Amino acid sequence: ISNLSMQTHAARMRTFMYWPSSVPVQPEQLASAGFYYVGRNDDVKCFCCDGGLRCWESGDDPWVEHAKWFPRCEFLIRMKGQEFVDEIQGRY
């Protein structure tokens, strides 16, 4: 999938068709946080920073996971703010 083709929410949403129903995080929450489905298991990537996340757990918040593992993402920073990211990185 072309990263440029995934710049808008609606485009990201349509990538989730065969997304496993057993995974306790929903496409809407993933797509909102910049993620699209790469078509394997529960693997997703961010359209902006190309960071990959998998093995979603109950209670996971995709924005928090985005900040935990890919804190330099500019989409993340513009949406949630550097302060949010700093705190998730343990900078208070």
Ligand X SMILES: CN[C@@H](C)C(=O)N[C@H](C(=O)N1C[C@H]2CCCN2C[C@H]1C(=O)N[C@@H]1CCCc2ccccc21)C1CCCCC1
Write out the residues near ligand X by the rule CB under 6 A.
Answer: 38, 43, 45, 52-57, 60, 65, 69
Does residue 49 bind Zn ion (CB under 5 A)? yes
Q: Distance (Å, rounded) from C-alpha 80 to C-alpha 76?
A: 6
Contact 80, 89 (CB under 8 A): no
Q: Could you tell me the two tokens for 27?
A: 């496409």
Does residue 73 bind Zn ion (CB under 5 A)? yes
Q: Distance (Å, rounded) from C-alpha 66 to C-alpha 77?
A: 10
Q: Distance (Å, rounded) from C-alpha 88 to C-alpha 7?
A: 25
Could you give the string, one character per residue 8-47, with x where binding to Zn ion holds by CB under 5 A and - elsewhere? --------------------------x-----------x-
Q: Which residues are annotated as a binding site for Zn(2+)?
A: 46, 49, 66, 73
Enumerate the known binding-site residues: 46, 49, 66, 73
